[PDB]
Amino acid sequence: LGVPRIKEIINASKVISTPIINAVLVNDNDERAARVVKGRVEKTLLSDVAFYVQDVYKDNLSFIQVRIDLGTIDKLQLELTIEDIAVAITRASKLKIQASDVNIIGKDRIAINVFPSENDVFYRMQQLRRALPDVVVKGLPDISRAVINIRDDGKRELLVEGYGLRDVMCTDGVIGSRTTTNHVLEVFSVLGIEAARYSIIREINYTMSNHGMSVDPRHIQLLGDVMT
Amino acid sequence: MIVPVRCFSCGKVVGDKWESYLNLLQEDELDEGTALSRLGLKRYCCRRMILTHVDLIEKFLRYNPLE
Amino acid sequence: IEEFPLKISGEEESLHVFQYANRPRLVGRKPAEHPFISAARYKPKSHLWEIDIPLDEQAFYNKDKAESEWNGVNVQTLKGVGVENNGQYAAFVKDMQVYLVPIERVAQLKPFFKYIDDANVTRKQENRLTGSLLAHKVADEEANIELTWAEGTFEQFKDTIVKEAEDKTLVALEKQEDYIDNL
Amino acid sequence: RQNRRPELGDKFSSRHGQKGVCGIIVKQEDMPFNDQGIVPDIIMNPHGFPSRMTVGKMIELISGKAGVLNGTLEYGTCFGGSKLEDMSKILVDQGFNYSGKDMLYSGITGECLQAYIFFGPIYYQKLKHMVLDKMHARARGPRAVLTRQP
Amino acid sequence: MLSFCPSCNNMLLITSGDSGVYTLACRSCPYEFPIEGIEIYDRKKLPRKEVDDVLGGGWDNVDQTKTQCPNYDTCGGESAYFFQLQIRSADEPMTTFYKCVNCGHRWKEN
Amino acid sequence: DEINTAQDKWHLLPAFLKVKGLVKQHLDSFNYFVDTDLKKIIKANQLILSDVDPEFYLKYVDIRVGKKSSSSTKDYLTPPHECRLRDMTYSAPIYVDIEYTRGRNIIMHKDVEIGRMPIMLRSNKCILYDADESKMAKLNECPLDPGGYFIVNGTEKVILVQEQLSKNRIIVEADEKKGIVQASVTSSTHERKSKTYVITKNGKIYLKHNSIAEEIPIAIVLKACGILSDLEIMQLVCGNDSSYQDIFAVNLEESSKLDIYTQQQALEYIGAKVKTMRRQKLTILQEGIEAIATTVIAHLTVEALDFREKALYIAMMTRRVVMAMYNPKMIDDRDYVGNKRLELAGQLISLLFEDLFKKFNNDFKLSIDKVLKKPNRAMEYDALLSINVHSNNITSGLNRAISTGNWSLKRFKMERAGVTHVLSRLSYISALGMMTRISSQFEKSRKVSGPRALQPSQFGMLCTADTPEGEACGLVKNLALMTHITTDDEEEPIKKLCYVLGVEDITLIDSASLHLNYGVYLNGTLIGSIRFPTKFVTQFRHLRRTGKVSEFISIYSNSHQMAVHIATDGGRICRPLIIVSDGQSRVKDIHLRKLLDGELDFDDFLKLGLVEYLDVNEENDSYIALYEKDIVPSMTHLEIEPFTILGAVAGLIPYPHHNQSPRNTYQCAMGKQAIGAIAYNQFKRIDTLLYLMTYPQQPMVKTKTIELIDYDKLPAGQNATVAVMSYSGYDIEDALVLNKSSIDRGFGRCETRRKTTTVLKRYAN
Amino acid sequence: XXXXXXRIEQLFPVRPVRVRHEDVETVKREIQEALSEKPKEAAAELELLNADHQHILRKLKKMNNKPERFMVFQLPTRLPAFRELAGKVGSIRVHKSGKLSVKIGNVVMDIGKGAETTFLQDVIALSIADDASSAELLGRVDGKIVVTPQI
Amino acid sequence: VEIAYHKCDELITLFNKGELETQPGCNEEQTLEAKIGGLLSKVREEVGDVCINELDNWNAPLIMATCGSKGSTLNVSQMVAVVGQQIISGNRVPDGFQDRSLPHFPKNSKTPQSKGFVRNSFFSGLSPPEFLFHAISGREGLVDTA
Amino acid sequence: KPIRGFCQRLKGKQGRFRGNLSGKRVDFSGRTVISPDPNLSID
Ligand SMILES: [Mg+2]
Ligand SMILES: [Zn+2]
Ligand SMILES: [Zn+2]
Ligand SMILES: [Zn+2]
């Protein structure tokens, strides 16, 4: 919030240190009101909800057994049980190596099968076991972490340290009318040039309002206008 | 170097008291304070004139180039 | 509140110690089965120990893969250079007395894959030289000093050491204060 | 060689990071004086103390005053030195205020100053930055031929 | 996996043999541990990564002071969280920063 | 009055400064150079042969500076002040004894002068050595001059103490969004290299050397160093801890992913990547090239068929990587004072003279070949006319390097500048503080304040106030008042001692049990393991307190990294502490009474085990009391005197603990610029610029430091009568009100002396 | 340890011992002796040294007449004056309370356990005769011993 | 200060033997840092408050701070009562040694004395460890100036 | 590489543009130490 922040704003860099997306909610409650949205915007969850992962061989077949625990998915308020975990695994392991038919034996012990110049099956299954507890099953793949804050009131806003503003605005349980990020180039790509100049002016005014820097807002307005 | 003729603050002559102060310290030794008071250096400016003087001219004269 | 003498001995006995890192001492409660040693090889002037242990054939051998990959792999070779370290004495107690025999060149044996080496060289087939270069040059140039593994004879060595400690006896004179500087 | 009179703009410091140039040179009779007629060689602003917090400088003033009145050089050693209470005892036993504040008279009005003035000896170093070596003024003259600039 | 040979203690790898048998074949040594209806499984636990509460604010754990902020005509604030940094030269003194607790207005009194 | 241990143990500080002065780093370094390093250089470059004429050789027998065998007295040197006046170099001749063969089988010695040695002031070879102020007056030298600098062409140059990161030690550094790299800048006697060691991706660990083309997988190198079970690799670098197994296991897979390995296969792999050797000995391009690649990968040169030492070095390298992988904060601070070494003027000059002598030998052998390439009448008599001619290059380069500060070293191949600086003559304290000044290593990315902050580990080693302003804030550092810089001690006498004390050599240890008991590291190298590391450390410290090993050798134990560390290398900053045993100090003022009476100098406090030197690392294992009144029954040492955490210049400040620290730093800056007395011969001096106070006064409030450094003999200032008050309005913003008629009586009266030098130069016409 | 990733028990596949990083130190002390199963930093070290003393007495009595047991000793390489060193050098006295001492000469020292070597050990005589070179196996080492001078 | 030191010690012994309530927003280790830093801040503020309240009419620093010409009540309190807490990088003095700021404190000590809190004022003088910590803070201010 | 080319003349803080075109040394100028003077008008 100082000289580096002013540098980023007036450089119009596409990547900033600590981007924040302030997302006001709709309801006033912690249990099953804000936690649902928080779970709706999270980085990655397979390691969160796996409780183990297997590296299994038999006479002719192999299994990578993951016993997803229901208790974690229940207390941690998320909406995902079997099938969407499976499809996330398919997509991510296809991006990694491949995924043609991922099975679910049932009762949350999802199994991933491996089959085909030798021992490459072993190497690929080792790589799959390593890369498996890093895939995203729930939450937007643009959020480093989401946090619920309180604005000195009974209002429990959540603000996320991510790079996706449109996803947060279109996420259910969030008001897209009042949901602003501090990334100017993100505001420009999502809301337009006028919102971009508003974001520039407000970000600069916030940056020098946190330092006792009494600059007339007309200078900031002129800076935003010349930039946009 | 050599003792200043006068006290910087007062203008009192202290350049005629350096040798008597040294002989008061050496012959029939006195404390520095009572030696200063015996010479009439009552004010603390004139006192520090003599108390803080570094007689560097004696060290300089060791390198006399006209021996 | 008692006394146990220790007697030095074996001033000429060259007693190497073999460290088989490949296999533990005690897998279970009882000590692990001592292996069978055959085709032992050692090189003077470079101190290389090569020890062959035959592999079991009734289980866990992969015979067809073994023949199709490397010609002669019936045994496992453990190679390790004996390292000259001083102050080491292997000992035994015979009559409530510990008899000390100095150790020569403890050896750390690790598995060796000479068959893989031969397969790789037969695939690839189609100046003072100081430092550690001379070491490997000598080691792979001057070699082939065959050894015959004669396992079983302790009692003769034991009596010779006992004969060497019973017939000789000496006292010390050096001051303790001088020893702390002799350290 | 060149003798140098301390003039206006010459820099001084006092062993505590309190440096400054000579702002004015005043006649002795314009200076404030004490009951014995002692006149300060240097007057330093009290405003340099509150924000810089050089309490060591005040302690040095009191210790030096006690030392000059007692005939002994005092010690300001780190984590030690001469205790302030002993210096105050010396000051009181010689007739001065325990805190080194003396009642001075104005040199220009002659009246008592309404506040007691911190009055005593402080070691002052004259720094090598004299205004005589800094005063520069060019009207016209040498130019760099490449750029034809001064 | 992370299994090692009993002979040469090199790392064991799964190799596809004849009839698609997943044996624990050892490279560098003639060692074969086949799987005859035996389930070779590796299980490693993973962290739960539980829920986290609202961030809120721990401003009670900050050093206040007795100063009236310039915006005293809007709010009656006599306190300000502060920290002092000497962003000025060694000849200059130290600079103090303030933040009014009644409005959240920050200012440096230098 | 009886001695009181609390207020009289400070006399150890004057006792220590009596025999170990402030300018003693330079003096000891130069004395050691001219006494032993010259001998070492002459013995290393002892015989230059010629391809032609085998029945002929040149042998350097002995080397001596400023003394011949003709008389017991030394050679007459031009006095340093005469050198200053005459714009020449205060130097002594270098003599060697030459065994050059004659054509008629004649063996003979000689005493040949091969150049001039710029002599440090007040060194062993200096004429001011142990001069009694009367000889000093005769030689026109101030007895209060620090010495420790050189007069080259009339200019006083000081070789500043240099900071650098310690060589031959592992440094682990993390990063955000890049990965973890940890290096070992290994400097041998002839080749310096940084065995950089980086992680690329997938938690895969690689070794990245300058000579190697591409970073080699770590399992490849570990197998190439004889450690080839591939279970002991993971046992060595992970031990029994499950997390490190999972973190490291990925690069076990890539060991077999290419193909399964013997030692020699990985050897050939690593040897394939060697870059070049300027195309000499080309017929080594086989599996034999990896041997030189591995043997010249670090300072652990292997001269046999056993690679366990280098293998374990790489294994601990990897293990530190893996701990940093599992968690950050297992990296080590690069700005830690214990991770830095101080190289001194003697070391600099030793390496510079090594290079100059190598050039001299090469050119002399070129001249020998040119003379002896003629077919006939090759007379041998007086083969040293050329050496009489060619001695000028050693003198010329040796003078030019010191004069300019630029040091062009061909052998080691870096170009460093700013080694030497013109000695400051603004004030006596200016000169003294220019000595004991340390310059830190460049290329530091000054954009950050990393190596600019004060570290707590510099307490009592580097002054906490004497740092510059403007641009070199925190980069230029100064020695604390009571410090010592360790010298190099041979480590083979003490590896034997470690084995005597119970350390088992790494050649007797198995990999599985290595992380079960503490390891013992000698100068960063795992030499073995030991049971009872606490007892081993206690025995070593007792053996050092009784004088059986060098008092500069440091032993300390690390709990997080299971390791007992022993350091014998030079360049480590250390300071003396009183040893506290069983809740009591060991001095107990009978030794203080003896010390004050005249017996028991400072060295005897070391010989009786009452005091010992502690470097920055042993202070981790210590628990120091500042005073006697807080000696609790768990403390290992007692501060001799805590004000020694300030340097010489910061000691000018009265009551610095009552001031804000920036004010103390600013006074450290200003005192060097104060005008005062320069020297007892300042009116004999003819300097380019010299400010002198007419009527200097000693401060009324002094410190122990100013009397320890004799500042009260050449004071720079005056005791102004000061009234703290607002006056006249001309004193706002630091401005001062000066008394006219105090100036009239000589207050603040100074003078400047300026020299102008002209030479009447002869010309070719 | 923790959870272990589950014709001759010595010919089955071997995995390393994996203990959690949380209880790594507690298991490390327990398995320092448990891996063998042969038939505060000052008090803890002294108590462990007393344990080593009692184990030394136990193994020394268990080696009193056995015809293959060996105990490798680490003696200081520069022993006290009395290698061509012949005959009895001194004694290993068993002090009260179970603690041991060793007199290599007129000097009194102490004796420790050494690093726990969890692998098979064997002593062998190397006799390279020009007529016939033979390597003779003598026995197996039951544990190392370190003898340390005390001041 | 003894009241505040005792609370810090009780929190230290709780954090050592067991587990104190981790703050929701910050992880376990820095919860103690924030708690005891706030407690020390409060004790410094109250000591400065009583210092200023008992300060004499016609006190020169008080007049300069009241009129705003030079200084502040924080400067006056640091000179008279207590130089509160030496903060670098927004938190207390970090470890210059292994799990320890200085070898003059015990290892793994999080007590206010060991991590930058200066009980003394500039009038009473700084003990050597407080001197070093204050020097570190002033030096980082100086480097920010550069 | 100390060869000063034509683009080395133009590029740099002490180059051509930033050193001589917009910013340069001026005639009829002075510089000395500054002292206070209350009896001087603020202008
Ligand atoms: Mg300034
Ligand atoms: Zn006077
Ligand atoms: Zn194997
Ligand atoms: Zn407000």
User: Per 3-state DSSP, what percentage of chain G is helix, strand, and coil (rounded to 5)?
Assistant: 25, 30, 45
The residues pairing with F505 across neighbouring beta strands, listed in sequence order, are: F528
CB contact under 8 A, E90 and D19: no
Choose the closest CB to C60 out of E9, E10, E32: E32
**Helical axes A120-131 vs A83-96, angle rounded to 10°:** 130
Please state, in angstroms and rounded to a whole number, the distance separating the CA atoms of residues F699 and F706. 10
Q: Residues in chain G, how many?
A: 151
Please state, in angstroms and rounded to a whole number, the distance separating the CA atoms of residues F649 and F663. 13
Rg (CA), chain B: 13
Chain F residue at shortest CA distance from B54: F697
Structure tokens at G115: 């690093």
Listed residue (G139, G114, F231, F225) closest to C23, CA to CA: F231
Task: Write the DSSP assignment of chain D as a string of letters.
Answer: -EEE---TT-EEE-SSS--EEEEEEE-GGGS-B-TT----SEEE-TTHHHHH-BHHHHHHHHHHHHHHHHT--EE--TT-SS-HHHHHHHHHHTTS-TTSEE-PBPTTT-SBPSS-EEEEEEEEEEBS--GGGT-EEESS---BTTTTB-
Listed residue (E98, E93, E30) closest to E67, CA to CA: E98
Chain E residue at shortest CA distance from D53: E93
Ligand nearest to the CA of F662: 1
Residue environment code for F223-242, b if the CB has 16+ CB neighbours within 10 A, otherwise e: bbbbbbbbbbbbbbbbbbbb
Question: Which value in Å is the resolution of this experimental model?
Answer: 2.6
CB contact under 8 A, G13 and E5: yes
What sign does the dihedral D23-D27-D30-D35 (CA atoms) show? positive
What sign does the dihedral F71-F76-F77-F81 (CA atoms) show? positive
Please state, in angstroms and rounded to a whole number, the distance separating the CA atoms of residues E25 and E32. 5
Structure tokens at F294: 């591995």
State the distance from the centre of ligand 2 to the C-alpha of A25, rounded, in angstroms: 80
DSSP class of H114: G
Please state, in angstroms and rounded to a whole number, the distance separating the CA atoms of residues C162 and C100. 10
Interchain CB contact of B64 with F (< 8 Å): no
Structure tokens at G7: 């014709």
Pinpoint the alpha helices (H) of A28-69: 35-40, 46-50
Structure tokens at F599: 């017996």
State the distance from the centre of ligand 2 to the C-alpha of C87, rounded, in angstroms: 83
Listed residue (F304, G116, F553) closest to C85, CA to CA: F304
Phi and psi angles of residue A217, each rounded to the nearest 5 degrees, phi first: -65, -15
Choose the closest CB to G125 out of C8, C15, C92: C15
Classified as helix, coil or strand, F473 is coil
Residues of G in contact with E12 (CB under 8 A): 13
State the distance from the centre of ligand 4 to the C-alpha of E64, rounded, in angstroms: 13
Mutate to test the interface with A, among F177, F246, F253 (most CBs of A within 10 A): F253
Please state, in angstroms and rounded to a whole number, the distance separating the CA atoms of residues C74 and C77. 10
Structure tokens at D76: 């300001």
Name the one residue in this structure whose structure tokens are 């100028």.
I29
Listed residue (E95, E59, E66) closest to E80, CA to CA: E66
Residue environment code for B23-51, b if the CB has 16+ CB neighbours within 10 A, otherwise e: ebeeeeebebbebbeebebebbbbbbbbb
Instruction: Find chains touching chain B: ≥3 CB pairs under 8 Å.
Output: D, F
Residues 665-724 of F with CB under 8 A from D: 665-667, 670-671, 673-676, 691, 693-694, 697-705, 716-724
Listed residue (A89, A53, G24) closest to E45, CA to CA: A53
Listed residue (H130, E96, H40, D102) closest to F658, CA to CA: H130
Residues of D in contact with I25 (CB under 8 A): 149-150
Residue environment code for D78-98, b if the CB has 16+ CB neighbours within 10 A, otherwise e: bbbbbebeebbebbeeeebbe
Residues 594-653 of F with CB under 8 A from H: 619-620, 622-626, 634, 639, 642, 645
Listed residue (E40, C19, A122, G16) closest to F231, CA to CA: G16
Q: Residues in chain H, how many?
A: 146
Which residue type is seen at F289? I
Residue C15 and residue C90 in contact, taking contact as beta carbons nearer than 8 Å: yes
Chains D–F, number of C-beta pairs less than 8 Å apart: 300
Q: Residues lining ligand 3 (ion), CB within 5 A?
A: E 5, 7-8, 10, 26, 29, 31
Angle at the Cα of F192 (from F188 to F197), degrees rounded to 5? 110
Please state, in angstroms and rounded to a whole number, the distance separating the CA atoms of residues D131 and F376. 76
Please state, in angstroms and rounded to a whole number, the distance separating the CA atoms of residues H14 and A118. 58
CATH number at residue B43: 1.10.10.60
Listed residue (C88, C133, C95) closest to C5, CA to CA: C95
Choose the closest CB to H65 out of D50, D56, D79: D50
Residue numbers of E annotated as active site: 91-92
DSSP class of F35: I
DSSP class of F743: T
Name the one residue in this structure whose structure tokens are 């507890």.
A133
Please state, in angstroms and rounded to a whole number, the distance separating the CA atoms of residues F429 and F433. 6
* Method used to obtain the model: cryo-EM
Please state, in angstroms and rounded to a whole number, the distance separating the CA atoms of residues D99 and F619. 42
State the distance from the centre of ligand 2 to the C-alpha of F761, rounded, in angstroms: 56
**Helical axes A120-131 vs F250-258, angle rounded to 10°:** 160
State the distance from the centre of ligand 3 to the C-alpha of D3, rounded, in angstroms: 92
CB contact under 8 A, D71 and B33: yes
Structure tokens at F612: 């010992």
State the distance from the centre of ligand 4 to the C-alpha of H75, rounded, in angstroms: 22
Classified as helix, coil or strand, F537 is helix
CB contact under 8 A, D23 and F751: no
Angle at the Cα of A145 (from A144 to A147), degrees rounded to 5? 155
Task: Write the DSSP assignment of F581-598 as a string of letters.
Answer: ETTEES-TTHHHHHHHHT
Listed residue (E85, E89, E83, F663) closest to H141, CA to CA: E85
Residue E29 and residue E47 in contact, taking contact as beta carbons nearer than 8 Å: no
Please state, in angstroms and rounded to a whole number, the distance separating the CA atoms of residues F223 and F494. 30
Structure tokens at F700: 């009324």
F490: number of Cβ within 10 Å: 9
Interchain CB contact of F262 with C (< 8 Å): yes
Structure tokens at F132: 């009694």
Structure tokens at E109: 């009194």
State the virtual CA torsion across F146, F152, F158, F160 in degrees, nearest 10: -160
Angle at the Cα of D86 (from D83 to D91), degrees rounded to 5? 125
Residues 17-36 of I with CB under 8 A from F: 35-36
Residue F641 and residue F482 in contact, taking contact as beta carbons nearer than 8 Å: yes
Choose the closest CB to H145 out of E52, E66, E86: E86
Please state, in angstroms and rounded to a whole number, the distance separating the CA atoms of residues G127 and D58. 89
Structure tokens at F692: 């002198």
Give the Å distances, CA to CA, from F345 to F84, F160, F352: 21, 7, 10
Interchain CB contact of F245 with B (< 8 Å): no
Residue F577 and residue F639 in contact, taking contact as beta carbons nearer than 8 Å: yes
Query: In what helix (H) or strand (E) does residue H11 lie, and over which residues does it extend?
Result: helix H2-17
Question: How many helical (H) and strand (E) elements, i.e. helices and strands, does chain G have?
Answer: 2, 5
Choose the closest CB to C61 out of E8, E9, E30: E30
Number of domains into which chain B is organized: 1
Residues 4-23 of I with CB under 8 A from D: 20
Q: Give F340-374 as a 3 state SS string.
A: EEEECHHHHHHHHHHHHHHHHHHHHHHHHHHHHCC
CB contact under 8 A, F669 and E9: no
Residue D53 and residue H122 in contact, taking contact as beta carbons nearer than 8 Å: yes
Strand order in the sheet with E31-33: E15-16, E22-26, E31-33
Classified as helix, coil or strand, G146 is strand
Strands F484-485 and F584-585: unpaired
Instruction: Find chains touching chain E: ≥3 CB pairs under 8 Å.
Output: A, C, D, F, G, H
Chains E and B touch (3+ CB pairs under 8 A): no
Residue D41 and residue F739 in contact, taking contact as beta carbons nearer than 8 Å: yes
The answer for F331, left when phi > 0, alpha when psi is -120 to 50, beta otherwise, is beta
Listed residue (E91, D96, H69, D100) closest to F726, CA to CA: H69
What sign does the dihedral A192-A194-A195-A199 (CA atoms) show? positive
Give how far the C-alpha of residue F183 lies from the chain's centroid of Cα atoms, to the nearest Å.
20
Is B46 labelled as part of a ligand binding site? Answer: yes
Listed residue (D60, D13, H139) closest to F462, CA to CA: H139
Listed residue (C41, C22, C18) closest to C110, CA to CA: C22
Q: Beta-strand (E) ranges in F174-297?
A: 181-183, 185-187, 192-194, 206-207, 216-217
Q: Whole domain around residue B34: which residue ranges?
A: 1-66
Please state, in angstroms and rounded to a whole number, the distance separating the CA atoms of residues F347 and F356. 14
Residue D102 and residue D96 in contact, taking contact as beta carbons nearer than 8 Å: yes
Ligand nearest to the CA of D38: 2
Question: How many helical (H) and strand (E) elements, i.e. helices and strands, does chain C have?
Answer: 5, 9
Choose the closest CB to G116 out of F234, F241, F513: F513
Residue C90 and residue G137 in contact, taking contact as beta carbons nearer than 8 Å: no
DSSP class of C104: -
Q: Residues in chain D, how many?
A: 150
| Ordered domains of chain H (ranges, CATH) | 1-126 (1.10.132.30)
Give the Å distances, CA to CA, from H98 to F558, F575, H17, H118: 9, 19, 21, 22
Pinpoint the alpha helices (H) of F530-632: 533-545, 590-597, 602-607, 618-621
Interchain CB contact of H55 with D (< 8 Å): no
Residues of E in contact with A60 (CB under 8 A): 19-22
Phi and psi angles of residue F457, each rounded to the nearest 5 degrees, phi first: -75, -10
Classified as helix, coil or strand, F208 is strand
Residue environment code for F156-188, b if the CB has 16+ CB neighbours within 10 A, otherwise e: bbbbbbbbeebbbbbbbebeeeebbbbbbbbee
Q: Beta-strand (E) ranges in F360-459?
A: 407-409, 414-416, 420-422, 437-439
Give how far the C-alpha of residue A51 lies from the chain's centroid of Cα atoms, to the nearest Å.
21
The answer for F477, left when phi > 0, alpha when psi is -120 to 50, beta otherwise, is beta
Greatest pairwise CA separation for chain I in angstroms: 57
Residues of B in contact with F683 (CB under 8 A): 60, 63
Residues of F in contact with A126 (CB under 8 A): 253
Please state, in angstroms and rounded to a whole number, the distance separating the CA atoms of residues D61 and F723. 10
CB contact under 8 A, F534 and G45: yes
Residues of F in contact with C85 (CB under 8 A): 505, 507-508
Which residue type is seen at A223? L
Residue F255 and residue F220 in contact, taking contact as beta carbons nearer than 8 Å: yes
Residues 40-79 of E with CB under 8 A from G: 41-45
Residue D9 and residue I32 in contact, taking contact as beta carbons nearer than 8 Å: yes
**D16 class by beta-carbon count within 10 Å (0-12 exposed, 13-18 middle, 19+ buried):** buried
Which residues of E fall in the annotated binding site for Zn(2+)? 5, 8, 26, 29, 69, 75, 100, 103
Residue F291 and residue F306 in contact, taking contact as beta carbons nearer than 8 Å: no
D35: number of Cβ within 10 Å: 10
Please state, in angstroms and rounded to a whole number, the distance separating the CA atoms of residues F435 and A13. 48
Structure tokens at F65: 């500076």
Which residue type is seen at F153? N
